[PDB]
Write a protein that binds this ligand. Structure first.
Ligand SMILES: CC(=O)N[C@@H]1[C@@H](O[C@@H]2O[C@@H](C)[C@H](O)[C@@H](O)[C@H]2O)[C@H](O)[C@@H](CO)O[C@H]1O
Ligand SMILES: CC(=O)N[C@@H]1[C@@H](O[C@@H]2O[C@@H](C)[C@H](O)[C@@H](O)[C@H]2O)[C@H](O)[C@@H](CO)O[C@H]1O
Ligand SMILES: CC(=O)N[C@@H]1[C@@H](O[C@@H]2O[C@@H](C)[C@H](O)[C@@H](O)[C@H]2O)[C@H](O)[C@@H](CO)O[C@H]1O
Ligand SMILES: CC(=O)N[C@@H]1[C@@H](O[C@@H]2O[C@@H](C)[C@H](O)[C@@H](O)[C@H]2O)[C@H](O)[C@@H](CO)O[C@H]1O
Ligand SMILES: Nc1ccn([C@@H]2O[C@H](COP(=O)(O)O)[C@@H](O)[C@H]2O)c(=O)n1
Ligand SMILES: Nc1ccn([C@@H]2O[C@H](COP(=O)(O)O)[C@@H](O)[C@H]2O)c(=O)n1
Ligand SMILES: COc1ccc(C(=O)NCCCCCCCCO)cc1
Ligand SMILES: COc1ccc(C(=O)NCCCCCCCCO)cc1
Ligand code: NA
Ligand code: NA
Ligand code: NA
Ligand code: NA
Lengths: 395, 395
């Protein structure tokens, strides 16, 4: 079965931080799952003091495709709960900086957490044998060390950079790292010579578009801001922040030529009069107003690259290698590989059979074939598969 | 004469960043000054592309007490200008992160900058002999190393934590460091036994108040936010940011009990619905609504301490040592020493005679006497001097 790691540590100030993925795995479960999580994930549903969070919003349940679980649903799974007291110990070991504690969680081993993971997995005979893989929503060297000792793989799984409603929902599935330390570039490198994609970047973008474009845009410099305590801005950012990203652009452009777009999930917005503030209904309308795009490691950086905009990417992320190729032809091929083979149809990362498939580490051809089958469920070599999928969308 | 260091490096995206202090020294000059600055400080006045900045606002000129300079004014001083090309070199040595370059400027030696400072000071015979002290608006180990080689002191001088209109204007004057690495605590330690202040913290606060209080406030937890690229949040912050400060408070309080106040000089404000946002006309009205106050190293932390609020100070700053004393009596004495001896009447740090005075390193008694003379210009031991000054305000 699956061992899904959903840590309860409230680094950013919210209990059950990964509640949406908990709900999605529960909803899609074909088999009994092993959850390694916190007490808070089980009780949050009967806690009216936070019934207003976004995971209970019907639009959120519709866009992500889950239902709130019930006793029947939950009852057929096993739960290992981490203890809240080690959290306070960890905070006190980092000057009580919860965000610096997050960073350490994401990027360093925590021997005490290893030891508690080992005891939880040991607490019931047979648990370890039934584990076919770990699944983790974030990098976590504590868990990766435990997994090595036990001979288990760790799938790092997250929502992807293309998301509804603008796009088909995508997910990350990476055996090395999600967002930071990813294997997307290394998987492409072993395939770069087995590529001949007869489509432009626009076509790749069009394939995932679920909406009509805004179209027909100007502002020399677009600045993408991110959520300030996103793991992306905590560990994978090369020390850049929204404020230093903004200064970086001002080293290059006069204020009149800068268009700034705050992240809609952020607790902060821009002061209304100093730079021009973007008011677009979506990040695609925002980048269409822009000649150049500047980001640390936002999902929007990928959007800009696919629509052909000169993009500056200051942080580490899964898609950066596409931007670092020099040839236009290589850039198209890399983007196609990223979109059709690295990225996963969102629902499939919660599908047990699909996960078993990937655990066998099959050929790139097979992975692309499975993804296109999903994408096409209502409408050969690797190149041949993607060219036909695109062609079928064309008419 | 004075050698005033006003670096031109636009780390935060503005040319002539320290233009206000340039104007204030020019306005108050009784003698010819040596300015070590950038070309931009001289030409900014004839540049209409930024006539809208705050240093040209009449309210700003009135509150700080300077006039815009003219040819006569400027003409009797000497100017050493730093070259813009080393700036680009420095940025490229820090991954083109302007804020990380700022940090390095504030906290590490830059041999190439030492070498250029040495050449500028050498470029005209006699310059070095006429230097009685350096004045710097920020810590700068490049300049401190040069100063040691030449046998010159470095006065670190800044606007203080109490400012008009709420307060009499104050300034910092510190031979070791301003904001970070300060000597306020060490100066108090040599005097702690020569103290007997017969006033409360409220009286000390009242002495500097220039306004009627808002009065009569509740919200358990006040969170003071700062400007995101303030040197205080770049180098002296112990890695804390507004976002991690906010999370720190959420580890301790429910969202309902949190009152957040954004800095009015910030480019960012808070999202309108998640925490309660302070709308006070001034930081004093904001902290009066609060049972506890949380800051990294804002000037407001001092305000909270003087009004008796439980204050948490997560970063380094000049006033923190006051908060770390355990006795109420010691806390009062430390605050009195800080306010009357460490802090300086704003105008005096631009007064050449006063600076010559401090360069002689006189007794704490003498420093307090001079400050009270200034404060009293229109109305003994060290304790005796402050008790009488307070008493005279009383009636
Ligand atoms: C209406 C629709 O198709 N919505 C998408 C979700 O699909 C629905 O919910 C899942 C649970 C079913 O398996 C599908 O057959 C479908 O009925 C989907 O889960 C999410 C994620 O891609 O996207 C919605 O748009
Ligand atoms: C499904 C989704 O994208 N949700 C968004 C949130 O991101 C998810 O939840 C947090 C807990 C994780 O750290 C993210 O990595 C991701 O898995 C996001 O935090 C909020 C606010 O921007 O918006 C949701 O839509
Ligand atoms: C009106 C007033 O006193 N304003 C204060 C400033 O003082 C004035 O300007 C200076 C240049 C003169 O030397 C003073 O005699 C006075 O006329 C003062 O400079 C600033 C700073 O403390 O504060 C104003 O409130
Ligand atoms: C005189 C004053 O307090 N001005 C405020 C600005 O601070 C000063 O200017 C910058 C360039 C320095 O880095 C500060 O250390 C200080 O000397 C401040 O930046 C702006 C915005 O908050 O507000 C002015 O009033
Ligand atoms: N400045 C920003 C950043 C993100 N976004 C939206 O948020 C989603 C996730 O972006 P991040 O990866 O930047 O969190 C993007 O696909 C885009 O829809 C936005 O609309 N404006
Ligand atoms: N959150 C904040 C921070 C500062 N301030 C004001 O800004 C001035 C300087 O504060 P900092 O030292 O925090 O920059 C303070 O004296 C106070 O008047 C405010 O009004 N609200
Ligand atoms: C306040 O406005 C300003 C702000 C900064 C400058 C300034 O010195 N630029 C020089 C370096 C610019 C970096 C370009 C690197 C190119 C590789 O990408 C001028 C004016
Ligand atoms: C989402 O709400 C939350 C957020 C965090 C917690 C939580 O685990 N607190 C435990 C540590 C709190 C730190 C106090 C240290 C005391 C020294 O100052 C609970 C609920
Ligand atoms: Na499409
Ligand atoms: Na490229
Ligand atoms: Na007063
Ligand atoms: Na104290």
């Amino acid at each position: 079965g699956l061992a899904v790691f959903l840590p309860p540590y409230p680094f950013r100030g919210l209990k059950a931080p990964y509640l949406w993925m908990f709900y999605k795995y529960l909803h899609c479960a074909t088999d009994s799952i092993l959850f390694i999580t916190g007490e808070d994930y089980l009780s949050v549903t009967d806690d009216e003091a936070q019934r207003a969070r976004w995971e209970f919003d019907p639009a959120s349940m519709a866009s992500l495709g889950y239902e709130l679980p019930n006793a029947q649903s939950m009852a057929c799974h096993e739960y290992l709960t981490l203890d809240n007291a080690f959290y306070e110990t960890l905070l006190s070991r980092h000057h009580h900086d919860p965000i610096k504690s997050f960073s350490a969680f994401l990027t360093e081993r925590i021997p005490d957490l290893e030891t508690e993971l080992h005891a939880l997995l040991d607490s019931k005979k047979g648990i370890i044998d039934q584990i076919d893989t770990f699944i983790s929503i974030c990098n976590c060297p504590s868990l990766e060390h435990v997994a090595r000792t036990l001979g288990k793989e760790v799938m790092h799984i997250e929502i992807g950079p293309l998301r509804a409603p603008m796009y088909r929902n995508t997910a990350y599935l990476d055996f090395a790292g999600v967002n930071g330390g990813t294997e997307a570039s290394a998987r492409y490198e072993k395939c770069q010579a087995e590529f001949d994609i007869k489509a432009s970047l626009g076509d790749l973008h069009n394939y995932f578009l679920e909406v009509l474009p805004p179209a027909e845009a100007h502002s020399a410099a677009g600045v993408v801001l991110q959520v300030e305590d996103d793991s992306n801005l905590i560990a994978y950012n090369h020390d850049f922040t929204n404020i230093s990203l903004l200064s970086y652009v001002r080293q290059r452009y006069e204020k009149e030529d800068i268009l700034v777009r705050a992240h809609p999930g952020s607790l902060f917005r821009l002061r209304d009069d100093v730079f021009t503030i973007d008011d677009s209904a979506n990040s695609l309308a925002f980048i269409n107003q822009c000649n150049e795009v500047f980001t640390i490691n936002s999902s929007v950086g990928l959007e800009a690259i696919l629509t052909g905009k000169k993009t500056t990417v200051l942080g580490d992320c899964s898609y950066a290698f596409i931007n670092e190729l020099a040839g236009a032809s290589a850039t198209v091929n890399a983007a196609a590989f990223y979109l059709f083979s690295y990225l996963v149809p969102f629902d499939l990362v919660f599908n047990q059979e699909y996960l078993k498939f990937r655990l066998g580490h099959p050929e790139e051809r097979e992975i692309v074939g499975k993804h296109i089958e999903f994408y096409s469920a209502d409408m050969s070599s690797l190149s041949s598969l993607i060219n036909e999928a695109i062609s079928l969308e064309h008419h």
